Write a structure and sequence with these properties.
The structure is cut from a larger assembly and holds chains A (54 residues), B (119 residues), C (44 residues), D (117 residues) and E (109 residues).
Chain A (H helix, E strand, L loop, with lengths): L8 H8 L9 E3 L6 E3 L17
Antiparallel strand pairs in A: 1-2
Chain C lengths: L8 H8 L1 H4 L3 H13 L7
Chain D lengths: L6 H12 L7 H4 L1 H39 L5 H10 L6 H10 L1 H15 L1
Helix pairs in contact in D: 3-5, 4-6
Classes of the chains: A little secondary structure (54), B alpha+beta (119), C mainly alpha (44), D mainly alpha (117), E alpha+beta (109).
Bound molecules: magnesium ion (40 copies).
Chain D binds 4 RNA strands through helix 1, helix 2, helix 3 and helix 4.
PDB class: ribosome
Keywords: antibiotic, tigecycline, translation, ribosome
Entry title: Acinetobacter baumannii ribosome-tigecycline complex - 50S subunit
Chain lengths: 54, 119, 44, 117, 109
RNA sequence: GUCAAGUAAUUAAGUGCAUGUGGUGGAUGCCUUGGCAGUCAGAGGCGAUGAAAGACGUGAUAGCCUGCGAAAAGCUCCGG
RNA sequence: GGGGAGUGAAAUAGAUCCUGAAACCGCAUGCAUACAAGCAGUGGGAGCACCUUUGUGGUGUGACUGCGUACCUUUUGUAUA
RNA sequence: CCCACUGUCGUUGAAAAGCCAGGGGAUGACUUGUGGAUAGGGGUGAAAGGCUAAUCAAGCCUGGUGAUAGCUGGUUCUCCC
RNA sequence: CUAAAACUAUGUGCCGAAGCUGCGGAUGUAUACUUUGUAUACGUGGUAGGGGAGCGUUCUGUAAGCCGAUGAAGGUGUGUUGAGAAGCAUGCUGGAGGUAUCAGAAGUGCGAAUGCUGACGUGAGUAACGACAAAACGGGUGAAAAACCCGUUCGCCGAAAGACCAAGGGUUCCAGUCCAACGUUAAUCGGGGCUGGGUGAGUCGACCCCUAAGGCGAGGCCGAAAGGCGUAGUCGAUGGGA
């Protein structure tokens, strides 16, 4: 139910050794030069040479 | 296990789920472009495309079926006068789903659902 | 649950009020003690 | 005369924690643990001042044994023969000679051999 | 020559901001701004505020071009905590800490 | 050159120690506006002419404090 | 919130403001560490790095290795589970 | 409406005694509002030592009071005999 | 491990302790002897406990002295000295005090008391986010919108989850404005902050007249005192009176 000894700072860091984040997959769109998330629409509404909300 | 099972849950009862997809389909047929969560958008295909397939042929029985599945008279009118005639020689694929980042308050992945030859 | 306080202002003033304290020797000793301590409120 | 025990107590704790540099974890940071660690290091060092002499003598004896067995002897008979030949070189010097100068050690083994005969 | 920006008193614990700080340490500022733009982390917003502040400082106060600036140093320290009470079952009470942090960013050529 | 046998260097997800540089925190030092104990000398009461203690008010503009009381941060006279 | 500019003798004296310790939490550098069993040290000891020097020098680290079951209290007696 | 028989759940609870499903009484020796009375070796008790402000084989507060404790615990720098 | 690495007997060597010896150093007692320094000898494991000698801290005198902005105390390193408690010097920080010596007085030394106060860890970025009546989309605003507003749908209650009083609360009511903190998330929203506004009575209620239970009670009776009971009266709504 609870620890019998306080965990040392070294073991705590060794547990967090798997906590790192990853970057996302970003691509530069060619029809706008923009950078967007891959397979995602841009915030301007562009995706693969197609426009939403002109 | 879940082997070969189809369908979603989305944390709702089946009554709530049926109602929510009815609402979503009505909204999409009215605006032709909506923003929703990505799993909702992917399940909305199996709900909204058979309605268009139904609206391809205009019979009183078909319009009554469309009303039983939408319960929205304006949606039925639009299906059988605009959307049905539009997708007459298109063999499926009336919706287009495009991933659209994440919601702010939620970090839930989002998607746009639009009709194919809209606007 | 029903808790013990159950307020009523008339009953408060009739049990712990100024005139109730002034009406007996022990209550006036209460008032003298609370003046000696420098309390800002003498009574309820 | 109220005495505040802040400067002197801090000085003492700092001394104990300076004698604990290099120890692991709390043993170098936390005074209660560092103080025991330091007292124990002291007891260990006292005991090991004695143990070091035994350890180095055993090393010299092993090296002399190797050198004497390269010369057809053993440590026992070589030490006995060198003591019968009035040679009084001690084991530290004998082990140094065996490790660094094989010809002089063969000469010493010859003295021991001739005395054993 | 490093140019510094300090975001002091950001309402987030250091443990969570450090995950984002580790992501962009030693990177170009264009790459770091890209990484921070497309993250769903709350710390990404605050680290982006601090990093774009450092870039603006480098350009205005130090006359450094942005195309070769680099995130040469970044670290998150703890700040002043807020202490609050949380009622628990059976009349027990717990102490809640609302942890803040200080972000330091240094950009260099 | 190839093959075989033998045998080095080379990683750090993270961690330890040391140093450097920070954060947090508010110890220490220095300081005193407040206290403690006395000595000497006084005084030892206030109140129906309404006390102690209060409430409410009172300001060009005031929240609280202090003063004051519908004559209300005050009126008159005398002295400095 | 900060960076400059300015004030000031001083701004890591900038209002959470004299000094600014420890616990505790970062980042940077050097060395070690992913075939190896335990109070984490101690005695020895290679290698590496940096200072210096022509050192049998200093500073950090510490492969490998012998020995080694915390402190207090209470007890006939405690590594004591 | 008053109560609380059974069970599950809850047991750092939504809750320092509940919820939910069932259960009992429900024109009476009923339930309930407002106001009043009884005060600590006392009160009140269709009586369980029950209740008397989440406290009851003698309430709480203050004072005697720094009660007493042949019992636990603790007792702070150095060296020498 | 088997003509032993077993057993019996015998021998020659060797290893082996903080024992003994060597070398160097300190110290107690005693004896000589300068007359307090060296020799000589014997000694120097220790709990309870007894004895002896010291270190350091605050304060008083010495001190109207001595050191200090050419940098005190304090803090943080380094080097060094002593058997120890400790001392000394010095780099950085710091910005105004410090104090020899010899006496004197003690709130004079902390690791433990399930010690006390404050700070900060571990658990751990874990459990949980408070009724399983339910949401969806479009537009607006905004730095930012799952939650705010407008709209279109969906759902839930409907002997309460609606409406009105008493009690209690005390401005939470309404409008403009702001988002740090508070709101178990965000918030542009709010019962949050700031500014302003708002409660209109002969008939409603209270006050008022009247009394119940009960209280207080001139006199009075009783009681060491304090006080207790009570007559006349006077209060007291939960009831009566336009
Ligand atoms: Mg680390
Ligand atoms: Mg399938
Ligand atoms: Mg869910
Ligand atoms: Mg149903
Ligand atoms: Mg790493
Ligand atoms: Mg202080
Ligand atoms: Mg400074
Ligand atoms: Mg400061
Ligand atoms: Mg290895
Ligand atoms: Mg026992
Ligand atoms: Mg026993
Ligand atoms: Mg033992
Ligand atoms: Mg134990
Ligand atoms: Mg154990
Ligand atoms: Mg029930
Ligand atoms: Mg019945
Ligand atoms: Mg009693
Ligand atoms: Mg009686
Ligand atoms: Mg009984
Ligand atoms: Mg009793
Ligand atoms: Mg006591
Ligand atoms: Mg020996
Ligand atoms: Mg001996
Ligand atoms: Mg000697
Ligand atoms: Mg001895
Ligand atoms: Mg002894
Ligand atoms: Mg003391
Ligand atoms: Mg303690
Ligand atoms: Mg989470
Ligand atoms: Mg866990
Ligand atoms: Mg889990
Ligand atoms: Mg969970
Ligand atoms: Mg909720
Ligand atoms: Mg409102
Ligand atoms: Mg918030
Ligand atoms: Mg408000
Ligand atoms: Mg009476
Ligand atoms: Mg009378
Ligand atoms: Mg009356
Ligand atoms: Mg009435």
């Amino acid at each position: 139910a609870v620890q019998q000894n306080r965990k040392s700072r070294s073991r705590r860091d060794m547990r967090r050794s798997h906590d790192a984040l990853t970057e996302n997959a970003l691509t530069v769109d060619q029809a706008t030069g923009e950078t967007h998330r891959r397979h995602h629409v841009t915030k301007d509404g562009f995706y693969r040479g197609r426009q939403l909300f002109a | 296990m879940r082997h070969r099972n189809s369908g979603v849950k989305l944390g709702r009862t089946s009554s709530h789920r049926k109602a929510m997809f009815q609402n979503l389909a009505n909204s999409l047929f009215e605006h032709e472009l909506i923003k929703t969560t990505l799993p909702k958008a992917k399940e909305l295909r199996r709900v909204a495309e058979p309605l268009i397939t139904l609206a391809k042929n205009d019979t009183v029985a078909n319009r009554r079926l469309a009303f039983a599945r939408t319960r929205n008279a304006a949606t039925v009118g639009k299906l059988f006068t605009v959307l049905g005639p539009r997708y007459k020689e298109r063999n499926g694929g009336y919706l287009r789903v495009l991933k659209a980042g994440f919601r702010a308050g939620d970090a839930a992945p989002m998607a746009y659902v639009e009709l194919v030859d809209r606007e | 649950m029903k808790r013990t306080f159950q307020p009523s202002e008339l009953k408060r003033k009739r049990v712990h009020g100024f005139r109730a304290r002034m009406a007996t020797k022990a209550g006036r000793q209460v008032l003298a003690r609370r003046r000696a301590k420098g309390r800002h409120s003498l009574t309820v | 005369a109220r005495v505040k025990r802040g400067v002197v107590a801090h000085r003492r704790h700092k001394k104990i924690l300076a004698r604990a540099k290099g120890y692991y974890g709390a043993r170098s940071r936390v005074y209660r643990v560092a103080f025991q660690a330091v007292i124990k290091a002291g007891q260990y060092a006292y005991r090991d001042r004695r143990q070091k002499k035994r350890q180095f003598r055993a090393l010299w004896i092993a090296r002399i044994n190797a050198g004497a067995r390269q010369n057809g002897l053993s440590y026992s008979r070589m030490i006995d023969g060198l003591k019968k030949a009035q040679v009084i070189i001690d084991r530290r010097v004998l082990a140094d000679i065996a490790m660094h100068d094989a010809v002089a050690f063969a000469a010493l083994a010859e003295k021991a051999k001739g005395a054993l005969a | 020559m490093e140019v510094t920006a300090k975001l002091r008193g950001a309402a987030i614990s250091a443990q969570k901001a450090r995950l984002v700080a580790d992501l962009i340490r030693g990177k170009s500022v264009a790459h770091a701004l890209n990484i921070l733009n497309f993250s769903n982390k709350k710390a990404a917003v605050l680290v982006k505020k601090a990093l774009e502040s450092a870039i603006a400082n480098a350009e205005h106060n130090n006359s450094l071009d942005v195309d070769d600036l680099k995130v040469s140093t970044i670290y998150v320290d703890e700040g002043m905590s807020l202490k609050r009470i949380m009622p628990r079952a059976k009349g027990r009470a717990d102490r809640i800490t609302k942890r803040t942090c200080h972000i330091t960013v240094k950009v260099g050529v």
